[PDB]
């Protein structure tokens, strides 16, 4: 298995870990803030996914400093992870095309 594919897999497992810890930590950070909605684990997990993918419907979001800091980590982990898959796909195509060109 080439590096890029290995890194892709690793990036994926790591994202899953960030999502779960992010969901757990968001609840921990947000409970105690009057008005917060990111306070139960099931929807927090959903919030973590739509944040990692940067969709951000706006149905749920953190209102506290630490909830927001946790959100930033999730955003960056998602962007980085998917960005890394793109780079792996590019490498795959670059390699295949170099062969097809007989180089």
């Amino acid at each position, epitope marked *: 298995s080439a590096l890029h594919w290995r890194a892709a897999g690793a990036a994926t497992v790591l994202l899953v870990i960030v999502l779960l810890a992010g969901s*757990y930590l968001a*609840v*921990l950070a*947000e*409970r*105690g*803030a*009057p*008005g*917060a*909605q990111l*306070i*139960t*684990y*099931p929807r927090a997990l959903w919030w973590s996914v739509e944040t990692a993918t940067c969709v951000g419907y706006g149905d749920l979001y953190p209102v506290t400093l630490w909830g927001r800091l946790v959100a930033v980590v999730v955003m960056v982990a998602g962007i980085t992870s998917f960005g890394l898959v793109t780079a792996a796909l590019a490498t795959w195509f670059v390699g295949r095309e170099q062969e097809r060109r007989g180089h």
Partner: antibody
Amino acid sequence: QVQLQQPGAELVKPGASVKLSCKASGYTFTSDWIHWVKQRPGHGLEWIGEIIPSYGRANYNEKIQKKATLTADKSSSTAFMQLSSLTSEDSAVYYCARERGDGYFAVWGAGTTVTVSS
Amino acid sequence: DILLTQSPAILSVSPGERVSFSCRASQSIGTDIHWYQQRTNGSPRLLIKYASESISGIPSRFSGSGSGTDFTLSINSVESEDIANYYCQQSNRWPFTFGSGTKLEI
């Protein structure tokens, strides 16, 4: 089997403090929160606060005067609530309840009747 | 903080009739409402979670409905054992809050 065990009663002198206990059994998850609810005779249910034993973080009802301090003991699976400097206004049944982090109180304790008197 | 209004405070019904308890939230809370039954000198007991989802061990005559700001707890054919106080509770926003409760008289 009873998931939450609470002592039946506690007599407290005005001004004094008491530490109520809530021993939990059954399934325990890192996502569990133990809540405390106050119910005065003839009145409804009033939320006091909550605590997540897996982390030790506690939040309290901001609308009422803070009389409690929540702690938890992971090894003995027990949650505690320290009520301090009580008055007759603190006389009531205090229930502990378990929430799986999904918003509802699936199980409640039998409740401890606290009487503040001389 | 979300105010939960339970009115009327007391509901009288004849044995066997269908009864409905009202719970109105001060703002929209989706379906994050839960219902509890508390009999004289007993501790609260979960009846319905998330507005309409049934709980195991609870008689089938118990059901809930509604979304947004208005919710209903219904009992199909009330019987003596249903005599108690009924409370709604919200978990949409922090902090969780409870309604004032409605008593069922037969």
